[PDB]
Amino acid sequence: VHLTPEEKSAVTALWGKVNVDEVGGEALGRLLVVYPWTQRFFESFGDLSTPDAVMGNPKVKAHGKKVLGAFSDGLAHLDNLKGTFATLSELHCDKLHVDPENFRLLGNVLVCVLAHHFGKEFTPPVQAAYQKVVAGVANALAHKYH
Amino acid sequence: VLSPADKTNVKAAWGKVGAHAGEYGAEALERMFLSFPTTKTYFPHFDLSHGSAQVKGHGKKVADALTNAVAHVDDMPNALSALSDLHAHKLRVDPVNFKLLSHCLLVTLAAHLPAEFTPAVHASLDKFLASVSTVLTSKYR
Amino acid sequence: SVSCQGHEPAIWQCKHHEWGKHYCNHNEDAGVTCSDGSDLELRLRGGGSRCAGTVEVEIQRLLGKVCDRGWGLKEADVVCRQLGCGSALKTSYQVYSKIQATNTWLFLSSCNGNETSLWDCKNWQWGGLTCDHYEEAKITCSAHREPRLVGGDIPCSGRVEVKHGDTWGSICDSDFSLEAASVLCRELQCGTVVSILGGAHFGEGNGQIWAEEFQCEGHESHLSLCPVAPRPEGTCSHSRDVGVVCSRYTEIRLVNGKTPCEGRVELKTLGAWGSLCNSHWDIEDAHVLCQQLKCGVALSTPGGARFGKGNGQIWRHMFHCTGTEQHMGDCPVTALGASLCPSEQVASVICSGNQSQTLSSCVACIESGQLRLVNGGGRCAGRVEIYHEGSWGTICDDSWDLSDAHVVCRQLGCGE
Ligand code: HEM
Ligand code: HEM
Ligand SMILES: *[C@@H]1O[C@H](CO)[C@@H](O)[C@H](O)[C@H]1NC(C)=O
Ligand SMILES: [Ca+2]
Ligand SMILES: [Ca+2]
């Protein structure tokens, strides 16, 4: 529906090469230092003042594993994205009150992180499919908001 | 809000780009076109085919302008005065498209030059590109 | 950003930017290099001879190389001139070995192209920067392979000798092909190749013989540019050296006349001087002769001669020049059994004396619509071709007879 079968193959292929342990910590650490208004939500994770502390903090790295796994879980079936993220969207809307833009910002940083880790293999058609995936996830986690 | 330590990274990182700046600008322009199809509406007569000479030519002039801005980092609005009027008063380019080009340009730099993109440099180069977009769009109406 | 004029007693006296600002990086730390001028040396390593290879710089015992970012044909010329080799032809060179890598580099900003040495042209940076994206600088001077013809009676013939570096040597016939000989004649400015002779016809050479066999495409402007491949030494005896005859083997002189641009035509063939026949001496052949004499374009040829026939025998050579070829050798010549020229009929030409504007297709015009004959085995027979606009075309065979072809044979000068 959303993606062509050739587009789906490449997206699923690259997601195999990823190192879930380190990619999640990388993207979360970058967002907390590039856009430094998300440090407010992660005050439970300790010191986050300096970029090296943000990268070296164990808690954000562990939270990166949770973020990455949920992204992989969302990739399981695209039409279910409304129902897949309905449980998580409520947490981000009623308890933490995370603005929908931060979902779009984290996804954009994820594309940059994946491009940094891979290199030339981040073919422009490949990133186009990834952006379409990211846009849906940001919309799906925000569609709960009303 | 580029601090003096932030501008030092910008000049050093852009220096490491070297002569490949023109190709990097061209790749970012092509990367944004196919990733965000609505952007092509602002280029009425340009040939949007992959590897087009005009796209390569446009990327060279875009990277030329950015390299000029780095040398004039302290005074950006004057170095980008002519481009600000053309991009806002003539073509009426929506400011939303600028954040798309900046993201695509950063991805091109990150993919082609991964070793030098430490998180400290990533923030500094991001703040530099945000400064350029605001200057160009500051008179949009 | 210290801006010293060049005469301040100390750097602090110069006008310099503030102790802060400008956002400098520690990789940009400046340095100096003061020397007496005798320690710096320039050498070429990794090539066939000293006039081709990778540029290597030794300054204060320290070895280094030169980056390619600022390299060009102008900078390539000044380096070759300093080494004494000659002019620079190619910015790449064929590798005979591998040179050791060195971390230190030399950078060229710009070079005017007429300086005596590389050190003289301004702002050459010695170390302090790296160019990993760029590569080494390579050159190939014109003294890599300098050809020469030795021991030939006619001006443009003799034994072929090729110079490697600063030493001379002959070349065996098996190494030299027809394509190689054409380049050699063109390089020497002796015209096109007329014939090639082997077996020490011109004479038995002396000295050492090169081993490599030239393998050139055929239209290279210099001997050095075309690639070569080494061959085993001693496979060719000394008697197997080659000789080359080029097309510009004619010597024609103007005499009796006080100004060299005017006078009676004199030709030297068979080891003697002789006057040319007046017949078949038109404007087109006259322009070529004056071009050879370097007088310039010519506008008039005398009808008869006040200069006389001369003491020498009357040569019956007749020339058929198109009008654009530089030398009389390139003009097709027919002299077998030419008609006898009476004593008072001797050719002459009055050149202008100005070498400018040559001849342009349209007086002093290369003309248009000149017919040519192809595939006929000669210059007087063949299929008719007509030059119209920028293309050559044929004629349909219908309504074609002797009276129709009578004009074509007359215009070409062949006859009937
Ligand atoms: C964009 C896609 C995102 C996904 C898939 C995602 C995923 C998750 C998941 C699965 C949890 C549950 C962790 C737990 O229960 O222990 C979580 C927690 C959390 N997320 Fe997200 N997240 C996203 C974006 C963001 C962003 C951009 C922020 C910015 C601050 C954020 C803020 C938080 C916070 C503060 C928690 C902690 C919840 C708590 O402590 O109760 N999320 N995230
Ligand atoms: C950092 C961001 C940008 C820079 C540095 C930049 C720079 C330039 C430069 C140097 C030119 C050439 C002008 C000339 O040759 O006269 C140009 C023209 C143009 N700009 Fe941009 N630009 C940027 C962003 C954008 C974006 C995002 C768009 C559209 C979505 C855009 C729309 C155009 C168009 C359509 C032209 C063509 C003008 C023409 O052909 O006459 N610019 N820009
Ligand atoms: C070299 O030529 C330039 C112009 O190209 C001229 O200004 C300069 O004086 C010349 N130098 C010498 C040494 O002839
Ligand atoms: Ca100075
Ligand atoms: Ca017929």
Coordinates of N, CA, C and O in Angstrom, one line a residue, chain B residues 4 7-8 11-12 19-20 73-74, chain C residues 21-25 27-28 133-134:
Chain B
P4 N 32.1 31.3 19.8 CA 33.4 31.3 19.1 C 34.0 29.9 19.0 O 34.7 29.6 18.0
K7 N 32.1 28.4 15.9 CA 32.6 28.8 14.5 C 33.9 28.2 14.1 O 34.2 28.0 13.0
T8 N 34.7 27.8 15.1 CA 36.0 27.2 14.9 C 35.8 25.8 14.2 O 36.5 25.4 13.3
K11 N 34.5 26.3 10.5 CA 35.5 26.6 9.5 C 36.4 25.4 9.3 O 36.8 25.1 8.1
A12 N 36.8 24.7 10.3 CA 37.6 23.5 10.2 C 36.9 22.4 9.4 O 37.5 21.8 8.5
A19 N 37.7 20.7 -2.1 CA 37.1 21.0 -3.5 C 35.9 20.2 -3.8 O 35.1 20.6 -4.7
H20 N 35.6 19.2 -3.0 CA 34.4 18.4 -3.2 C 33.1 19.1 -2.8 O 32.0 18.5 -2.8
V73 N 31.7 34.5 8.2 CA 30.9 34.0 9.3 C 30.4 35.1 10.2 O 29.3 35.1 10.7
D74 N 31.3 36.0 10.5 CA 30.9 37.1 11.5 C 29.8 38.0 10.9 O 28.9 38.5 11.6
Chain C
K21 N 40.0 36.3 18.0 CA 39.1 36.3 16.8 C 39.7 35.4 15.7 O 40.7 34.7 15.9
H22 N 39.0 35.3 14.6 CA 39.3 34.6 13.3 C 39.2 33.1 13.4 O 39.3 32.5 12.4
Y23 N 38.9 32.6 14.6 CA 38.6 31.2 14.8 C 39.6 30.2 14.1 O 39.2 29.5 13.2
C24 N 40.8 30.3 14.6 CA 41.9 29.5 14.0 C 41.9 28.1 14.5 O 41.5 27.8 15.7
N25 N 42.4 27.1 13.7 CA 42.6 25.7 14.1 C 44.1 25.4 14.2 O 44.9 26.0 13.5
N27 N 45.8 22.9 13.3 CA 46.4 22.4 12.1 C 46.9 23.5 11.2 O 47.7 23.2 10.3
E28 N 46.5 24.8 11.5 CA 46.9 25.9 10.6 C 48.1 26.7 11.2 O 48.2 27.9 11.0
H133 N 43.0 13.7 -0.8 CA 42.2 13.7 -2.0 C 43.0 13.8 -3.2 O 42.7 13.1 -4.2
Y134 N 43.9 14.7 -3.2 CA 44.8 14.9 -4.4 C 45.9 13.8 -4.4 O 45.9 13.0 -3.5

